Structure formats: structure tokens, C-alpha cells
Ligand binder design. Structure first.
Ligand SMILES: NC[C@@H]1O[C@H](O[C@H]2[C@@H](O)[C@H](O[C@@H]3[C@@H](O)[C@H](N)C[C@H](N)[C@H]3O[C@H]3O[C@H](CN)[C@@H](O)[C@H](O)[C@H]3N)O[C@@H]2CO)[C@H](N)[C@@H](O)[C@@H]1O
Ligand SMILES: NC[C@@H]1O[C@H](O[C@H]2[C@@H](O)[C@H](O[C@@H]3[C@@H](O)[C@H](N)C[C@H](N)[C@H]3O[C@H]3O[C@H](CN)[C@@H](O)[C@H](O)[C@H]3N)O[C@@H]2CO)[C@H](N)[C@@H](O)[C@@H]1O
Ligand SMILES: [Mg+2]
Lengths: 252, 252
């Protein structure tokens, strides 16, 4: 019957019950336990699931328990300090959506400031890593989407266009977030927060209005909006120095 | 302003240049080279990218080169035989979308039947792996989506509902593909092929109609369609035995 309505108090009880269970089972291998996500920001809605992180001392520790009771869902990730710190300092194309975890840490157990160290690492990532992630995003994702919607324009199918438009709008949101080196609060607010930022590529806000309103049935307006956004990207990358190497047929 | 229009003959010319370049650089470390994706089953549209794969003899080989010339995009993955076969034999929630690669391999170099060996491995995966992936999908993705759209109904934002509905429809497509052990052709045909399968959970095809048509502006009809799909999931999982024990507050 799906998730039920729960209050913040009930969630913190579950959190502290899980904390006790983790300490009973693993004992001194537990370096730190925190809550992240919406419950960590104390923004959590009545239906939100629970996300917790655990720093282990045992080397190469990397596992997780993800379950539901039928009424609520919990995910607990267990990582060694080294594994967690490397993850916090790696910038992938979906960094603005995944690494909000490290800017929403609610500590409930920490034997040696480990969670603070993870937070510091996540916020001190070198600027060059965001630059590379932006160039990789344009090649590995945006360029590929451009071929996908241009294929639709000539040979269809248009039934993929609304889903692909959503993907392009989400990828554009990642590109902006990588530029500003900021993580989005929640998944539901990614597009709302993306259009309120500075230095938007031309055509991005117009494209997002289709995705946020759900008016994705006019394929011609979508294709025309995607091309304008695709065009706006390339002046935007030159204006900010995110220059993509296009000089070789084969780069190895 | 790429990607540009290309013919199959122009793509195979680029492919064989890369094959020549791969053999020049890595020589006898190359066990096999193949083309997958749309060019692999030679359906490729006028704008499709080029996807290639390489089997290496080097033990820990796992790297990729992904680039564009401004006109076309190429991705070449280099994997040891052990790494590639283990990947082909592991079933994640996005198996129906990622592992079609292994059912579309066009060999252009193969020193010892390595590519046929990859195809055999990918198609002989134990039924238990698909069963576990289905149960994990329902918990890790579907249950989480249900909480998210129920939050939207109570506290918004409505601007996330069209994007979240697309995500739910794609997760349902994964659920169907894992059930029937089938991989989807391309990203563009995932939804069309998913709704043509048997044993659909009640409410999925109706939900896909909103996503495929792009009529995602009636949040009220979307939430009702999402709930109906969510109900159909619980009957569908019971009828096929994709049952997870949910009786414990903490299952470890
Ligand atoms: N190649 C065999 C195995 O691949 C894995 O990585 C897989 C996955 O993470 C990785 O995903 C990569 C991303 O990361 C990278 N940032 C952009 C790139 N386009 C994407 O590639 C994949 O996603 C694309 C669609 N978006 C597809 O067009 C493409 O065919 C597909 N290879 O591609 C691999 C799938 O083939 C592991 N690296 C390793 O277990 C072994 O190498
Ligand atoms: N935990 C720290 C690091 O996590 C990484 O994996 C990351 C990522 O793949 C992984 O993704 C996992 C999946 O895989 C798994 N099959 C289902 C699970 N819902 C999902 O979890 C993630 O996606 C959810 C939304 N769908 C989010 O609600 C959730 O907060 C998020 N942790 O979450 C991790 C981020 O926390 C690496 N394993 C490793 O570098 C290190 O352990
Ligand atoms: Mg989660």
C-alpha cells in the first residue's frame, strides 16, 4: 500500500533505532553515522524515505542495506573512510544531484570528526574537475541527445520526444550546476532551482517551461526548442571557456 | 552544428579506421573488436553515434575513449575478457537498457571467438538474477517514486510531476524487460516495445500513454494514473512471486 504518512519524530526514532542496531552489530568498526537527504536538511515531506551513511574503519568496506517495511523505506550505506572520501571528491555528470548528500549531513554518531572531514572534502573539490565534467557532459550526453532528437525529426518516433526532452532538461540542469559548483537541494526542485541561476545558456529556460508545465505534446515546438538550446550551449561554452576538443578524428 | 547526417558506409569507414588504430597501438593485446548499438544491428539512423567495444588480454584493462569531431561522436570501451564477461552476467535495474549491447555485437576482429563467448554469457544468465533485480527495482526505485509523487500531491512541486512520471514509466519498462528477460532495441523504442509485451501490471500502458503522447499537464490525472499503476504492481508482484519479506523493522 505504498509509503504511509510519517512525521519527522517517527523518522528520527527509526533513525536512532537503526543507529543502535548498527553499533550493536559492527561495534568498534563504526567510525561515524549520519543522516542525509531531506531528513538531514529537516525538510522531509510526509512520505519521504530515510537515507543514512556510515563510515566504517574496516578497509575496502562498501555495502548497503536498502529495504522497506511496507510502510516506509530506508537506505543505509556503509563505506570505509577512504572509499567515501574518494567518492566525495569525484565529479561525474550527475554531481549536482548526487553530492547534495555531503551538504546535508545530519550527524548522529561520530568518533573522530569523520563526517566533518567528508563535508570538507566534498566542498573543496578542484575547479578543474568541474571543468572536465562539463566537457564530458557535452560530448557523452548532450551531443548524443542532439542526434537522438534529430533522428526523431527525420524518422521518428515522436513518442520518445517527451521523455528525451525531460532528459535534456535534466542534463542542462546538471551543466549549470557544474558551472556554479553547487548541488541541488532535492530531486523535485532541480528544474525550479536551475532556471533561477545566473549565466543560463540561451533557450534553456524556454525548454524547461515545457518540461515543468508538462505541455510536451507539440513535437515541432519541442524540436525547435531543443535546437535553440543546442545552439545556445556552444556560445555559452565559449563564453565560459568550456572548450571541447574537436581537433582529432581519433584521440588515441 | 553537429551531429551531422551520415550513411552506414561512412560510419563503417570511421569504424575500420578506429580498428586499424586499435591494432596499431595495442597489437597482440587486442583479443577482439566489435561494433554494437544501432550500427551493430545496422539499423542506425542518419544521426546515430558509433559504439565500439574491445576485448583486451591485459588483466585489469577497463578504460574508454569517448570523443567528438564536432560532426560525429564515438565511444570505444576497452575491457579484459574477465571484466567484460562479469559485466555481461550481472543484472542491474537498467539491464534491459544497457545489455542489449551484447545482443547486437557485429564482429570486425576476433582472434578466438571471444565475442561469441560474450554473447553466450549474456544470454545464459540464471533466472534467479532477474528475480533479485526485480525485487530490488521495486524497493530501490518504484517504492521511492511512490513516496515522491505522494509528496507532490501534498506539498508539491507540481513542476516535477511530468519528469517524475517519465521516470516511473521508464522504471516500469525495466521491470517488464527483466521479467521477460528481454533487452530493448534503442532508447527511443523502450516505451513502444515495453507496452507490446504480455503480463503487464495493470495501469502501466495507460500511464505510458501520457508519457508517449506528452500530455503530462494534468497532474490530477497523472497522480491517479500513477496510483493505479502502483496498485497493479502489488497484484502483479504477488502473482509472479516477486515477494520480499517486509515483516522486520530492520532486516539485518
Ligand atoms: N564496458 C563494459 C563495462 O562497462 C561499464 O560501464 C558502463 C557504464 O557505467 C558506462 O556508462 C557510460 C558513462 O559512464 C559515460 N559517462 C558516458 C557513456 N556514454 C556511457 O556509456 C553507456 O551509456 C550511453 C547512454 N548514456 C550509451 O550510448 C553507451 O552505449 C553506453 N556504453 O558504459 C558502460 C556500458 O557499456 C563499466 N565501466 C565496466 O564494468 C565495463 O567497462
Ligand atoms: N556510498 C558512497 C559511495 O556510493 C556509490 O554509489 C552511489 C550510487 O551508485 C548509488 O546508487 C544507488 C544504487 O546503486 C542502488 N542500486 C539503489 C539506490 N537507490 C541508489 O542510491 C542512490 O539513489 C537513490 C535514488 N535512486 C537516492 O535516493 C539515494 O540517496 C542514493 N544513495 O548511491 C550511492 C551514493 O550514495 C558507490 N557505491 C561508492 O563510490 C561509494 O560507496
Ligand atoms: Mg534512496
Amino acid at each position: 500500500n505504498g509509503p504511509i504518512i510519517m512525521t519527522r519524530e517517527e523518522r528520527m526514532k527509526i533513525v536512532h533505532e537503526i543507529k543502535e542496531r548498527i553499533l550493536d552489530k559492527y561495534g568498534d568498526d563504526v567510525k561515524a553515522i549520519g543522516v542525509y537527504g531531506s531528513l538531514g536538511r529537516q525538510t522531509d515531506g510526509p512520505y519521504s524515505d530515510i537515507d543514512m551513511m556510515c563510515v566504517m574503519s574496516t578497509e575496502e568496506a562498501e555495502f548497503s542495506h536498502e529495504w522497506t517495511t511496507g510502510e516506509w523505506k530506508v537506505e543505509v550505506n556503509f563505506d570505509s573512510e577512504e572509499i567515501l572520501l574518494d567518492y566525495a571528491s569525484q565529479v561525474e555528470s550527475d554531481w549536482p544531484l548526487t553530492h547534495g548528500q555531503f551538504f546535508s549531513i545530519l550527524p548522529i554518531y561520530d568518533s573522530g570528526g569523520y563526517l566533518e572531514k567528508v563535508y570538507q572534502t566534498a566542498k573543496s573539490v578542484e575547479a578543474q574537475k568541474f571543468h572536465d565534467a562539463i566537457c564530458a557532459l557535452i560530448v557523452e550526453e548532450l551531443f548524443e541527445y542532439a542526434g537522438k532528437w534529430r533522428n526523431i525529426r527525420v524518422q521518428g518516433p515522436t513518442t520518445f520526444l517527451p521523455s528525451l526532452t525531460v532528459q535534456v532538461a535534466m542534463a542542462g540542469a546538471m551543466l549549470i550546476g557544474l558551472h556554479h559548483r553547487i548541488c541541488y537541494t532535492t530531486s523535485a526542485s532541480v528544474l525550479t532551482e536551475a532556471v533561477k541561476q545566473s549565466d543560463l545558456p540561451s533557450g534553456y529556460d524556454h525548454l524547461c517551461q515545457f518540461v515543468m508545465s508538462g505541455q510536451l505534446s507539440d513535437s515541432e515546438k519541442l524540436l525547435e526548442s531543443l535546437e535553440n538550446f543546442w545552439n545556445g550551449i556552444q556560445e555559452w561554452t565559449e563564453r565560459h571557456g568550456y572548450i571541447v576538443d574537436v581537433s582529432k578524428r581519433i584521440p588515441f
